[PDB]
C-alpha cells in the first residue's frame, strides 16, 4: 500500500508520466524484492523463462536487456517501432523499454487483417517491429528494417544499454502509439504523450482515489492504451497488477481465483461472457470494484456482476462499513481521451441510469454540437464532442482526417448525444448507427436493444437500413432509408401476428419512430 | 427565449461583465418600451413616484441620473459608496449607477444593529453612502462626506451625467461589497470584480446550459450580491425579473401569485416558512424550479416544495415531456463565491438525502483539508476549502482575516467535510459547532439532528461547548470540552424520568460519540 | 491612418484571425470605395480583367465568386484546396475564399519539379487545385478531383456563395499550408490555424504602430506563409498593400518606384541584389524601413540601403522629428514559427552585429539545449529551440518528421547557438554544417567567411567533412571527419604556397580550430 509520504513524494514529482513511471520508481528508491505484475505466463524473457511473477528488480532488469537490443538495432529517440504480439506482458515490457530510448511503440492488434497490419505500420514510418511467433510472418519479409520475436532479445544486450539512459521525456513528448478495437478498415493511429497518456491517474492521486485499487487485474486488451495505462497507475500505487492476456469469460474468471483481485478492468464482451458462466462455482469474494472501458456494458450483466464480493461504503458514524455487492463503473471513452470522460457507477441497489452518462470529468470539457459548432442548448440532438488535457495531440502521420475529426475547438467522439437541463449529458447511439427515415430518426443501437429487452423470444435482431441507389442517409448523410429488422427466435413462441406490428408496437410504446419491417431468419 | 443569435452576441461580447451589462444591453440594440425589472414599490423613483415596473429605457434613465447625482456628490473611479436600505430595488438602481461611474457600491444589510453597520462601512474608506429614509441616523453625522436618500436625487441631477460615460471595467475591477448574513460580531467586507460575479452565469451562457428560465422571482435578501448576479442575469436573457424585498413567507407567496415565476430563488428562511402554509390557498401553476443558498433548506420542507408546478424532462423517446413537479437545486457557496460552488437538485422522488452536497461545479475545484492542508483520502474528515475564479479577490481591507481563512490554496468554508469514492462531498458541521471528547468527536448540528426523526417530542434542542470558562476544544483546539444535549419539551405529556439515558440510546444506535447530561430550562 | 477607436475595435475582436480579417473588415465597416490592394496585374479578375488598384469592396465581391466557385465544385471544410501559382495576388485571393469556406488552401512554389509538385500535393489529400496557365499540366490529368484555372471562374459562380457564408473558425483550426524556400527533396507542409498565423501581428497591435508601417511593399514569395502574415496585417492597419510577385530586385525597384513604399518586405536574396544596383536612377526617397524574413542580409547590403530615405526619431519636446536613413530589420524566422521570433535592426551608423541576435520577442520562449533538452548556461554552445504561440501545431500528415524536430518541448531551428550571460543570442552556424574534427567543431560557414574575409585573394573557398563512408561527423553524429578548405583564387590571383599552414594561420590567429588541409580547384 501507499503511505502519505509515498503519496506526496508521487505529487511532487514533476518529471514523472508515461514515459518513465518504472524509472521514477527507481528514484523513490522501491523496494526491488516486491513483486509488482504477475502474468499469465505468455512472454518469454530474456533469459528463455516465461515469469509469472515480476519484481520490480527484475522489471529493471528486463526493460534495460530490451531497451539494450534496441539501441543494438538501431532505434533512436523519435524512432517508431511496431509491437504485434497477441501476450498482454510482451506489450508493456516493450512498452517501456521503446519509451525508455526516447523511441515510439506502437500497439497493433494481433488479428488485424495481416494485409491491414502491413500497411498499417508502413504508414506511420516505422524503423522495425516486434511480434510474437504467430504473427511474425504478418511483418516479416516486408521494408522493415527489422523484424524480430522476444527469442531474438537476450541477457548479452544489456551490456549495450546507451550512456545517459532512460531517455528524459518532455510532456509532450510521444510515449504510445495505439488504435482502438472494432473498426472498419484502416485502424486511425492514435499517439500519447508522456504528459497525456496518465493524466487523469494523476490527478486523482493530487486528490483521493476511489476503491483504494488494491490487487488490479488488467484484463483489457493488451493492444489498447489502458492496458499500459491502468498497469502504470497500479505499478505507482504499488498495487499488485496482473496482466491477463485473454478477454474469455472463463480465462479471466480463473484469473480471479488465482489472483484474487479487489478491482476488474474489462470491456464489455468479456463481462458479458462472466456473467452468463456458472458464477455459483468461483471464488468472487476478493472482488470490489470492476472497470468496464469503450462500449456501455449490458445492463443485466451488471446486475450479476455487482452481486459478488463486497465493497466499503461511508458508514453512519462516518467511518467505512463494509457491505455485501461490489461496484461496476462504465466509462464512455476512447483511445482518443486517453481514459474515461463520463463514469456511470452501478451498486447492488442502484437504480437504472437509462441513457444518462452524467457530467464530464473536471478536468475535461464536453458539449452537444451543431452541424457548424455551436453548443445546442438542452434538449436537442448533436454531435457529442470532448476537451481534455488527456486528449491525443492527433492521428499519426493523418493531420487531414484529425482536423475532419474537429469541430469548434473540440474532438468529436462520433456519438450523437443531448444534454438535459441540469447539464447532464445522454448518449443517443453512434453517427453512423442513426438512420433518416421518414418516421425519424432510428437510432438503431437504441431499437435493437429496446427491442431485445421487451421481446424473450428473440435471440438476437439487427436493424439494417436500406435506402435507394448510393443515397446516403445515416446522421453525416443527407438523404432518407427504410429500416428493415432482423429477428432471430430462440426456440419458438413464434408472433405471426404482423412480425412488424409486433415490434412496431413496442417501439410505438416507448415513442421509437417505427421500421419499416420486421423479418425472420 | 433568447434567440441563438442573442446568445451568440452576449458570447462574443469581451466586456461583458457585472461592471456594465446594462450598457451591454443597450449596445446590442434592445427594445427599450420593454418591461425588464418588476418591483415591490419600496424605491422611490426621482420623480418622486414608486413604479412597479420598470421598462429597459426607464431604467437607463433613473441609473443614469443617478450616476450624474453620485459624480456630482464628487464621486470618482475607486471609491467606496455605502448602500443601507431594506429596499431590494434600490440596491438595485444604485448598485448599477455607483458601477457605471467606477466606484464600488458596498451593500450592507438595513436590519444590522447600529453601532455595526456605522463601524462596518466606516473601515471601508467610503466616500459616502445612500439610504432609505429608516436607515439615515445609522450612518449620518459621522466621517462620511454624504448620507442621502433617494429624494436627495432630483430629475435634474440626470444632466450632471459625466463625459465619457459608462465606465470601461478591467476584468479585475471591482464592482460590489458584500458581507455574509451571519452576526459574528462584525462582518466581513467581500468585494467582487467586474469578472468574478458574473462568471459562472457567462460560463453557462457560452455552453448554452440552463433551461426554464423565464420569469424570476428574486426574493434574496437584496444586501447579498446573489441578488445581483440573478437579477443581472435575467436582464441579460431578457427574462423578466421581480425585486421582492421581504422574505416573509407571506410575501413571496402573493409574489408568486402576482408575477408567476418559473424559479424563485431565496434564502432557506423563506422555503421553511413558504413550506409549512396553507399551500392549498395558493396558486403555483408557474414553479418550476428553485434555488436555494446561504442555510441548506430541511429536506421536510423540500419535499413539500417539490410538489408543486411543472417541469420538463427528456422521455423515453428523447423528447421533451412535462411532469408535474418543480425542481429544488440546493447550492452551497457563501458570499465569497459570487455563486454556488456545490449543487443538490432535488426532484419529486427524491434520494440525494442525508448532507450530501453533490460534486462541485466544473469551473470550481475542491477538496477535504487537513491541518497540514493536504487533500484527504476518501473517508476521512477535514476542513473543506475551495478555489474558484468565482471566488473573491479578498476580504477588504482586511487582509489579515483573508489569509487565515485560507489554507493550501483553498480558501476556507469552515466547514467539515467528507468524500465517498466517487467523489461527492458531504457537509457534516460548521466548524465552530465541532467538540473532540474522549471516545471521538461528536458533530453538534449532528447530534442535535440525530433527536429529530429519533427523540420527536422536541421542537428544539441545542449542543454546546461549556468546558472551562473559556477554554476551548474545537476543532481547531487542541483540548477536550463536554458535549450537551440541552432540550425543549412543549405542553402535554411525553417526558420520562431520566434526565440523560434518553438521548443516548438513539446516538449509540446511530453510531455517535458520548454526550454527558441533559436538563431543562424555561424558555427564556 | 487607423484611429484609436479603430484599434480598440481590432483589439477587442475575440474572433478577429487569420480567418476573417476580410469579413472583420466588413463587421468594423471599414468604407468599401477605398484602395487598399496594389498589385503587379499577375492576377486574372472573374471577369477577365487584371486589376491593378482593388478596393475593399471589389475584394469582397472577389472573394465571395472566388466561395461560390469552390463551393459549386464541392469543396467543404477541413478539405485542402491546392494552390500553385506564381502570382502574389491570386495567392492572396484564393487563401482567402478557401478560407471562408472552412477548407484549407495549400501553397506550393510554382518552380517546383513536376514529379515533386505533384506528390508533395497529393500526400495531404487535396481535394483539388487551381493553378496558373503555366503550371495547369503539372497537376492536371491526376488524381485530383479538379484542377482549374482563374479562367473557370466567372462572375456567375458567386450566385453561388453558400448559406451562412463565412466559416466561422475555432482559434485551432487550420487556414493555410504552405512551405519553405531553399530546401532540396519533398518540402515540408507547415500548416498554421486561425489564431497562429497573425498571433505576432494582433500582439504588436497591442503596441503603437506609430505609421512607421505606412506603405507596405510585400516582395516575399507568394507560396510563403509570410506573404500573408503582411498583407493581413496591412489591412488590418488600413495601409495600402503592393504584392510584387517577382523578387528579382530590378522588379522590387520597379515597384518601390511606383507604389512609393514605405516598409519593404522582402527575402536577403531579393535585397543583395538590390544593394548591389545603381541607386543613382531610382528615386527611394519613401523608404523609413526595410524589413527582412528567415536569413540574414549581408551586412555589406544592409549599410548600403539604409543610406536610403528618412525616418523618425523622437524629439526633446516627445514628439517626432524626422532624420536621414531608414531602417533594416534583421529576423531569424521561419515558415514554422512565422513571424521573426528574434529582431536585429539596422539603421545608419549602427554598430556591427557580429554573432549576436538579440532576445526573442517577448511572447516566445527560446533555449540553447542540451542535447537532452535543457536549457545551457552562458558560453556553451547547443541547439536553438523556440516556443512560441506562433508555433505551427506540425507537419501536415508528417508527424513522424515533426517529432524528429523537436526538443524538450522546444521546436529545433536547425542552428547552433549560444547565450552571452546578459541573455542575448549568438548564432554559430547551422547544425548540419558543424564539423566534428579533433581540432574540435569547426563551423563550416564561419571558416569560409573568416578565409574569404581577410585574405582577399579568393572569390570562394568551401569546407568540406571527409571521415570514413557510412560515419556521419555532423554534431547529430557520434564519429569525427577531417576539414579540407578547397580554395578558388581570384582571376589573376598570387597563389602562393603551402596553403594548409597558410589557411590555418589566420583561422588560428581568431580562435578558429584548424583545417586538415588545403587545395584548389
Ligand atoms: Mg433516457
Ligand atoms: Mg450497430
Not at 506502437?106 to 514510418?125: D, H, M, V, W
Not at 510515449?175 to 504523450?193: L, R, W
Request: some cysteine; proline content about 6%.
Amino acid at each position: 500500500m501507499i503511505t502519505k509520504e509515498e503519496r506526496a513524494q508521487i505529487n511532487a514529482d514533476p518529471e514523472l508520466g508515461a514515459g518513465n513511471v518504472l524509472h521514477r520508481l527507481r528514484a523513490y528508491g522501491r523496494p526491488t524484492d516486491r513483486p509488482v505484475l504477475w502474468t499469465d505466463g505468455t512472454w518469454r524473457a530474456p533469459d528463455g523463462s516465461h515469469p509469472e511473477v515480476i519484481t520490480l528488480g527484475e522489471l529493471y532488469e528486463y526493460v534495460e536487456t530490451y531497451a539494450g537490443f534496441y539501441h543494438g538495432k538501431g532505434i533512436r529517440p523519435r524512432d517508431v517501432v511496431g509491437v504485434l504480439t497477441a501476450s498482454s506482458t510482451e506489450f508493456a515490457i516493450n512498452f517501456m523499454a521503446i519509451n525508455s530510448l526516447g523511441a515510439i511503440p506502437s500497439f497493433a492488434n494481433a488479428k488485424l487483417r495481416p494485409e491491414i497490419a502491413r500497411e498499417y505500420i508502413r504508414r506511420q514510418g516505422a524503423s522495425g517491429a516486434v511480434t510474437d511467433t504467430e504473427r511474425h510472418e504478418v511483418l516479416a519479409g516486408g521494408e522493415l528494417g527489422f523484424v524480430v520475436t522476444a527469442e531474438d532479445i537476450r541477457p548479452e544486450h544489456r551490456a549495450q544499454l546507451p550512456q545517459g539512459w532512460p531517455y528524459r521525456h518532455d510532456p509532450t513528448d510521444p510515449i504510445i502509439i495505439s488504435h482502438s478495437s472494432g473498426t472498419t478498415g484502416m485502424p486511425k493511429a492514435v499517439p500519447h504523450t508522456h504528459q497525456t497518456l496518465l493524466y487523469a491517474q494523476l490527478h486523482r492521486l493530487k486528490l483521493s482515489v476511489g476503491g483504494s485499487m488494491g490487487r488490479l487485474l488488467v484484463a483489457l486488451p493488451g493492444n489498447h492504451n489502458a492496458a499500459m495505462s491502468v498497469m502504470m497507475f497500479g505499478l505507482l500505487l504499488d498495487s499488485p497488477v496482473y496482466l491477463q492476456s485473454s478477454q474469455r469469460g472463463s480465462d479471466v474468471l480463473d484469473a480471479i481465483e488465482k489472483f484474487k483481485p479487489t478491482t476488474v478492468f474489462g470491456f464489455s464482451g468479456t463481462y458479458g461472457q462472466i456473467a452468463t458462466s456458472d458464477l455459483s462455482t468461483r471464488d468472487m469474494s476478493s472482488i470490489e470494484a470492476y472497470y468496464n472501458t469503450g462500449d456501455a456494458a449490458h445492463e443485466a450483466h451488471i446486475r450479476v456482476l455487482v452481486a459478488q464480493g463486497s465493497h466499503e461504503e461511508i458508514g453512519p458514524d462516518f467511518k467505512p462499513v463494509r457491505v455485501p455487492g461490489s461496484v461496476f463503473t462504465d466509462g464512455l471513452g476512447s483511445s482518443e481521451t486517453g481514459y474515461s470522460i463520463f463514469h456511470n457507477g452501478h451498486k447492488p441497489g442502484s437504480a437504472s441510469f437509462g441513457r444518462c452518462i452524467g457530467k464530464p470529468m473536471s478536468f475535461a470539457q464536453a458539449a452537444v454540437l451543431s452541424e457548424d459548432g455551436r453548443p445546442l442548448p438542452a434538449g436537442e440532438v448533436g454531435r457529442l464532442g470532448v476537451r481534455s488535457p488527456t486528449l491525443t495531440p492527433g492521428y499519426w502521420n493523418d493531420s487531414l482526417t484529425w482536423h475532419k475529426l474537429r469541430l469548434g475547438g473540440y474532438w468529436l467522439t462520433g456519438d450523437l448525444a443531448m444534454q438535459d437541463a441540469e447539464g447532464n449529458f445522454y448518449h443517443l447511439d453512434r453517427a453512423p448507427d442513426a438512420i433518416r427515415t421518414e418516421a425519424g430518426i432510428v437510432f438503431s443501437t437504441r431499437t435493437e436493444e429496446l427491442l431485445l429487452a421487451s421481446l424473450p423470444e428473440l435471440a438476437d435482431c439487427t436493424v439494417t437500413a436500406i435506402a435507394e441507389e448510393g443515397v446516403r442517409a445515416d446522421w453525416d448523410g443527407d438523404g432518407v432509408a427504410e429500416a428493415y429488422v432482423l429477428l432471430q427466435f430462440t426456440d419458438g413462441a413464434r408472433e405471426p401476428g404482423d412480425l412488424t406490428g409486433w415490434v412496431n408496437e413496442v417501439l410505438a410504446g416507448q415513442g421509437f419512430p417505427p421500421v419499416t419491417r420486421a423479418l425472420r431468419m
